[PDB]
Amino acid sequence: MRECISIHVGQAGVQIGNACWELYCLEHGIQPDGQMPSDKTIGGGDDSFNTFFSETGAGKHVPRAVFVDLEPTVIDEVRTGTYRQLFHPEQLITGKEDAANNYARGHYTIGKEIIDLVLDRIRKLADQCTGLQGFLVFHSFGGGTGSGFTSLLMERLSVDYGKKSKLEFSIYPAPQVSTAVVEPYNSILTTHTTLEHSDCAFMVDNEAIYDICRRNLDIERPTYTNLNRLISQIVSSITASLRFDGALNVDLTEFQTNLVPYPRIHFPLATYAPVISAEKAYHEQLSVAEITNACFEPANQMVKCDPRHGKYMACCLLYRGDVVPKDVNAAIATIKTKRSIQFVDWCPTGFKVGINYQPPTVVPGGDLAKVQRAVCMLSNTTAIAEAWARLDHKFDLMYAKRAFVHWYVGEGMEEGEFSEAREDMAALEKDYEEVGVDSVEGEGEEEGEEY
Amino acid sequence: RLKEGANINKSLTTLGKVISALAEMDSGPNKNKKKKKTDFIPYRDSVLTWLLRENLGGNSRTAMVAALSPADINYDETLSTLRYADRA
Amino acid sequence: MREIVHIQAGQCGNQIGAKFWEVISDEHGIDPTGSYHGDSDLQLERINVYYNEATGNKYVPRAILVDLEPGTMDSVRSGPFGQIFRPDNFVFGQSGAGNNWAKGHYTEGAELVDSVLDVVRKESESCDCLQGFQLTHSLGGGTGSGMGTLLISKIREEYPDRIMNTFSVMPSPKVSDTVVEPYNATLSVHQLVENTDETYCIDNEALYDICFRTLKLTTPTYGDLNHLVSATMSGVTTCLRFPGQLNADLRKLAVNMVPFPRLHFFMPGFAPLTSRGSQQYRALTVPELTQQMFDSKNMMAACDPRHGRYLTVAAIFRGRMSMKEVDEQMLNVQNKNSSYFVEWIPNNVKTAVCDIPPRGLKMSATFIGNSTAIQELFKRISEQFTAMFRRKAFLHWYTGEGMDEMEFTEAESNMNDLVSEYQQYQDATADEQ
Numbered sequence: 025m026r027e028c029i030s031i032h033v034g035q036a037g038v039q040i041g042n043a044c045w046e047l048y049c050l051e052h053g054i055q056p057d058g059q060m061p062s063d064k065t066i067g068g069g070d071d072s073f074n075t076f077f078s079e080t081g082a083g084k085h086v087p088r089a090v091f092v093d094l095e096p097t098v099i100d101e102v103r104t105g106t107y108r109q110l111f112h113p114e115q116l117i118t119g120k121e122d123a124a125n126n127y128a129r130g131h132y133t134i135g136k137e138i139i140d141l142v143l144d145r146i147r148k149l150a151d152q153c154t155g156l157q158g159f160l161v162f163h164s165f166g167g168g169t170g171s172g173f174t175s176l177l178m179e180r181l182s183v184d185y186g187k188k189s190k191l192e193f194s195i196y197p198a199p200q201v202s203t204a205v206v207e208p209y210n211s212i213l214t215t216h217t218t219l220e221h222s223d224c225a226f227m228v229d230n231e232a233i234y235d236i237c238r239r240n241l242d243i244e245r246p247t248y249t250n251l252n253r254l255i256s257q258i259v260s261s262i263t264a265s266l267r268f269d270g271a272l273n274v275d276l277t278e279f280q281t282n283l284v285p286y287p288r289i290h291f292p293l294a295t296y297a298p299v300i301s302a303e304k305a306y307h308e309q310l311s312v313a314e315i316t317n318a319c320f321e322p323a324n325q326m327v328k329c330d331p332r333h334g335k336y337m338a339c340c341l342l343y344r345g346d347v348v349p350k351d352v353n354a355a356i357a358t359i360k361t362k363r364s365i366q367f368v369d370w371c372p373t374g375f376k377v378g379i380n381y382q383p384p385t386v387v388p389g390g391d392l393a394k395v396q397r398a399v400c401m402l403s404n405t406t407a408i409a410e411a412w413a414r415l416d417h418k419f420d421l422m423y424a425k426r427a428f429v430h431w432y433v434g435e436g437m438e439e440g441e442f443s444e445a446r447e448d449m450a451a452l453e454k455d456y457e458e459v460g461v462d463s464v465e466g467e468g469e470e471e472g473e474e475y
Numbered sequence: 476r477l478k479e480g481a482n483i484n485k486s487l488t489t490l491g492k493v494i495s496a497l498a499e500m501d502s503g504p505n506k507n508k509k510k511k512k513t514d515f516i517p518y519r520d521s522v523l524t525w526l527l528r529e530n531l532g533g534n535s536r537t538a539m540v541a542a543l544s545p546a547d548i549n550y551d552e553t554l555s556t557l558r559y560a561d562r563a
Numbered sequence: 564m565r566e567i568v569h570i571q572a573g574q575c576g577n578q579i580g581a582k583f584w585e586v587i588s589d590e591h592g593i594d595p596t597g598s599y600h601g602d603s604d605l606q607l608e609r610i611n612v613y614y615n616e617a618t619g620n621k622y623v624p625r626a627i628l629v630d631l632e633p634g635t636m637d638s639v640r641s642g643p644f645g646q647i648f649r650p651d652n653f654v655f656g657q658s659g660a661g662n663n664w665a666k667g668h669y670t671e672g673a674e675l676v677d678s679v680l681d682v683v684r685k686e687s688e689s690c691d692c693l694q695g696f697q698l699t700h701s702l703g704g705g706t707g708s709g710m711g712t713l714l715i716s717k718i719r720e721e722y723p724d725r726i727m728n729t730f731s732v733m734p735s736p737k738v739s740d741t742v743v744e745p746y747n748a749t750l751s752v753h754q755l756v757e758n759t760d761e762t763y764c765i766d767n768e769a770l771y772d773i774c775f776r777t778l779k780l781t782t783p784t785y786g787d788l789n790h791l792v793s794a795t796m797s798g799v800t801t802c803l804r805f806p807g808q809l810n811a812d813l814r815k816l817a818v819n820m821v822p823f824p825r826l827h828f829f830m831p832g833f834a835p836l837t838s839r840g841s842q843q844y845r846a847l848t849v850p851e852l853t854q855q856m857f858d859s860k861n862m863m864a865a866c867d868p869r870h871g872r873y874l875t876v877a878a879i880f881r882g883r884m885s886m887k888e889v890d891e892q893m894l895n896v897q898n899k900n901s902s903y904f905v906e907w908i909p910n911n912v913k914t915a916v917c918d919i920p921p922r923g924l925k926m927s928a929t930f931i932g933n934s935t936a937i938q939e940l941f942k943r944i945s946e947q948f949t950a951m952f953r954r955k956a957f958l959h960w961y962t963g964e965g966m967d968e969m970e971f972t973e974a975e976s977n978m979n980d981l982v983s984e985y986q987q988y989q990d991a992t993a994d995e996q
């Protein structure tokens with residue numbers, strides 16, 4: 025029973041969770057009340073997939089999710105929204121203030137005296153599961169809660185469970201635009217915890233998703249709903265390998281076995297190829313080769329970085345719909361002959377392939393067109409270092425004058441921690457510069473008895 | 476008994492083959508002083524020759540001593556030993 | 564009474580096994596429910612090779628399915644021939660190997676191997692005179708490679724004097740679907756070279772080539788590749804089930820094909836193969852089957868025989884045909900292509916003939932080659948393996964499951980020694996000193 029537990033921390037995490045659970049409820053035919061008329065009409069089936077929804081005796085289906093936040097308003101919206109009767113009434117929302125974009129407030133001062141209730145409910149849920157696979161944690165860098173409570177929760181989760189995988193999806197702050205003045209501080213301090221306790225952290229940038237929405241969907245005035253729907257589609261494509269039958273299934277362990285060369289390098293980029301409006305869905309073939317090629321283009325990346333400036337170390341493709349293996353083989357062979365895409369010499373194979381029969385669904389009121397085929401691309405590359413490097417520069421420009429530091433130390437922090445975190449980030453960058461270097465030389469020789 | 480005899484005979488055959496190849500390669504270069512690659516010596520065909528790989532090959536010296544029986548009645552043994560002593 | 568126990572581990576092994584049981588049940592006229600409705604009386608004469616009898620005049624195959632993930636078992640049961648298998652032979656667990664050879668061999672598989680061995684021993688003890696075992700798996704995978712090698716080791720420990728075959732699907736340079744293919748392939752070959760009597764070399768690249776260029780299929784899928792493989796496996800052991808003018812047991816093939824203990828990797832092939840509409844344009848005769856068998860493009864291993872020498876070849880014909888034609892054709896093939904056959908064997912073509920052909924054909928033939936060119940395959944894997952082992956690309960995922968860096972080195976050294984052993988009988992003279 026391939027069960028997974030979803031954790032949503034912070035405003036961004038819980039809105040992404042809303043768009044998510046909308047998508048899965050649409051997928052499984054579960055009405056927003058939490059019932060499922062499909063089994064009643066047919067008379068029985070496995071459409072109540074155990075991966076996300078636990079089935080009670082009465083026929084209701086409760087999601088395997090925990091929502092956490094310090095601001096009561098964002099979860100008062102969902103406690104009185106359309107899906108109010110889907111979730112368990114226990115939402116674990118502290119009737120107090122918020123972290124206010126401060127790691128120390130969300131980790132030392134107010135991050136306490138709620139974490140026990142959280143861990144208690146994760147214990148209850150994990151007791152309810154059989155053969156639990158891993159955790160899918162949603163949060164956002166920069167924000168106070170999404171950094172502090174995520175750090176504390178991940179430390180505790182590593183201490184208790186340990187061997188269970190903990191995948192992470194996060195909102196890295198953009199290069200130019202930002203929604204707070206102390207984003208670099210929270211990012212540079214939460215990088216210390218995301219490096220150790222996580223197993224595979226996916227990063228997506230708001231500026232990149234804005235550019236994709238503007239270009240491909242022709243939405244000139246997007247909002248957060250579109251970005252959340254895209255992220256929900258990506259997560260659904262990731263998880264669909266263990267919910268529906270497929271020619272080549274890819275579980276959550278194959279993910280880490282194939283994408284993680286070394287323990288300190290688990291930061292792959294993610295892309296979704298067939299993003300297109302309904303009007304432009306016509307006049308195009310949308311075959312396997314087209315989507316495979318579009319996955320590799322720099323313009324379609326979900327993080328503002330150019331893969332051409334780095335090297336591809338690992339690659340994982342997850343196809344959905346009417347896809348046969350020979351098209352995937354042809355596309356991979358075609359890509360391998362392109363000089364613009366450079367692979368590290370120590371990874372001759374490079375590619376992991378997975379195929380699923382279930383095609384992607386369409387959310388009513390959405391923007392993505394109905395398509396027969398689709399693919400999701402997860403690539404571990406060295407270009408991601410650039411995405412970090414710029415932020416480090418900003419951190420320096422804030423830390424030379426010790427601006428906004430009294431706010432952090434007032435809640436129980438010390439100055440040196442900043443420096444420590446900075447040093448850790450520097451080390452990580454050095455690692456990303458050491459793995460991508462080519463091999464020394466042949467470095468070993470033999471003579472064929474020249475006498 | 477059959478299994479033990481068969482495995483012993485296979486081990487002896489492999490040992491004789493490796494010693495014969497080693498002796499031929501010893502004789503050849505010793506008079507010709509050439510380096511006809513390094514040949515292939517089937518060490519891995521038996522665990523006995525595999526464990527003794529360092530002692531058999533490379534720089535080394537080896538010597539097999541074979542016992543006989545003077546009784547007429549045991550002719551089939553003595554001649555058989557000769558056919559193994561002639562090897563290499 | 565010669566009787567064969569079939570084992571199938573992993574996704575690839577289970578799929579090929581399902582297609583194989585479909586083919587065999589069609590050949591022996593077995594209904595999906597397990598009853599018999601055939602016509603010829605010779606189908607029940609040797610049905611006990613693969614099937615046990617059941618009280619309602621039913622027949623149940625000796626298949627033993629193994630997998631560390633239950634999805635493939637659910638797929639197999641929910642299929643055309645799912646009901647035929649015994650429910651107790653579905654041995655499986657949860658939390659699959661995840662493409663990790665260490666998990667398949669040491670951590671996870673070590674706990675399920677006891678149950679699998681219990682089922683295998685139960686099937687073995689009910690066999691009147693067991694001949695050997697069969698295994699279907701993929702070297703480049705997770706559960707399949709590790710558990711297959713572990714089961715082979717255990718069985719050879721328990722049954723030393725029985726034949727052990729292996730229809731293993733090895734990775735390819737171009738068509739690669741997993742990023743840790745070289746480690747799994749190396750560590751699997753390190754065990755197969757020791758604990759197997761016969762191994763058949765299969766890869767998806769050659770089967771795709773056959774589908775594209777011979778059958779002219781526009782959109783082939785895994786079903787067709789499994790179909791070709793299953794045709795080969797049914798062809799190999801035909802002489803155990805039907806009468807013949809010149810029989811050929813599995814042990815006869817092993818004796819004639821294997822000159823030395825470590826050279827037991829074979830290149831399979833099947834004839835005839837035609838693309839539907841072309842069927843009327845070409846006659847079926849023994850010369851045509853011989854021409855197609857020895858064609859370079861018909862091999863299912865992606866190793867060109869022209870880059871080496873055939874140590875041995877075996878041909879198993881099925882159908883009513885004249886022995887003079889077979890002998891003359893094999894002698895002609897030996898004489899004309901004199902440079903592609905090893906010089907120090909006077910005659911290295913085994914021939915066998917069986918009267919009964921397949922259902923919808925008049926004649927057919929299976930080809931099993933043993934040539935030096937197979938070393939190329941191993942070399943390619945080595946050419947990748949070191950390129951990942953020098954920098955320790957994904958090594959920690961293995962060392963966290965109990966393994967060690969020395970074991971990789973032993974596997975590499977063993978494969979290199981095998982490659983050298985094949986390479987020695989590959990140049991077309993040895994005169995200069």
Ligand SMILES: CC(=O)O[C@H]1C(=O)[C@@]2(C)[C@H]([C@H](OC(=O)c3ccccc3)[C@]3(O)C[C@H](OC(=O)[C@H](O)[C@@H](NC(=O)c4ccccc4)c4ccccc4)C(C)=C1C3(C)C)[C@]1(OC(C)=O)CO[C@@H]1C[C@@H]2O
Pocket residue numbers: 585586589590778787788790791793794795797798835836837838839842921922923924
């Ligand atoms: C009726 C007739 O004359 O037509 C042939 C036919 O057209 C051809 C093309 C058949 C046909 O095969 C294919 O199209 C095919 C496609 C993908 C992979 C493999 C085969 C045939 O389908 C296959 C089928 O073969 C059999 O029935 C054999 O007994 C075969 N068994 C099965 O294919 C089988 C299929 C489903 C379920 C159970 C068994 C077999 C082969 C070896 C050993 C035992 C059995 C035959 C005679 C034909 C058709 C029907 C068109 C061929 O079949 C084989 C492998 O013998 C492909 O090339 C040969 C030569 C034939 O001329």
Ligand SMILES: Nc1nc2c(ncn2[C@@H]2O[C@H](COP(=O)(O)OP(=O)(O)OP(=O)(O)O)[C@@H](O)[C@H]2O)c(=O)[nH]1
Pocket residue numbers: 033034035036037039040094095122123124125126130163164166167168169170195202203204230248249251252
């Ligand atoms: N992609 C995406 N990002 C969001 C969304 N909502 C908020 N964010 C990001 O979150 C950042 C703001 O910090 P939050 O994550 O909201 O912090 P918080 O959850 O409110 O916790 P506090 O700081 O204590 O209030 C912004 O910079 C956004 O980039 C969303 O709906 N989609």
Ligand SMILES: Nc1nc2c(ncn2[C@@H]2O[C@H](COP(=O)(O)OP(=O)(O)O)[C@@H](O)[C@H]2O)c(=O)[nH]1
Pocket residue numbers: 572573574575576578662701703704705706707708732739740741767785788789
């Ligand atoms: N012929 C064939 N090969 C397959 C099939 N499925 C997977 N493979 C091959 O097996 C490899 C994957 O190994 P896998 O079956 O997942 O190993 P497992 O996880 O232990 O079962 C791939 O490289 C494929 O080439 C199939 O249905 N048919």
Ligand SMILES: [Mg+2]
Pocket residue numbers: 034035094095122123167169
């Ligand atoms: Mg907040």
